[PDB]
């Protein structure tokens, strides 16, 4: 699965960045979901005030 | 950090792709913080109207 020396170690390091960047965007998504349930419930309230 | 011509450039380019996507998600995050500080102050006002 390997043969050197066209970057052995450096290819695994970018494979690590992709798992942090892949998990990073998941938290970002989950924020946009909370902010989305919040704006959903605020809208609901702005209606009961009308 | 590379060895040619076994895709010297193509490993360096994707190594580049990861640096923009990392700054990219950083700007995306910065928006979700503003829209959230914004919805926070809008909420504050919808409360002062109630």
């Amino acid at each position: 699965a390997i043969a050197s020396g066209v970057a052995v170690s450096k290819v695994l390091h970018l494979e690590g960045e992709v798992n942090k960047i892949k998990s990073a965007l998941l938290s970002t998504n989950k924020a946009v979901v909370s902010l989305s349930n919040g704006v959903s419930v605020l809208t609901s309230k702005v209606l009961d005030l009308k | 950090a590379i060895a040619s011509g076994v895709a010297v450039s193509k490993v360096l380019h994707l190594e580049g792709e990861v640096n923009k996507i990392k700054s990219a998600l950083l700007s995306t995050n910065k928006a979700v913080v503003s829209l959230s500080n914004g919805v926070s102050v809008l909420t504050s006002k919808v409360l002062d109207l109630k």
Binding site: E17, K20, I21, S23, A24, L25, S27, T28, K30, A31, V32, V33, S34, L35, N37, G38, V41, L42, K45 | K22, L25, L26, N29, V32, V33, S36, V39, S40, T43, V46, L47, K50
Partner: peptide, 23 residues
């Protein structure tokens, strides 16, 4: 209203985790 603010509280906590990974 107090619950709309917990949604913003927990969305802002999700960005600091995102940014805690960058990195």
């Amino acid at each position: 209203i107090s619950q709309v603010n917990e949604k913003i509280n927990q969305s802002l906590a999700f960005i600091r985790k995102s940014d805690e990974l960058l990195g």
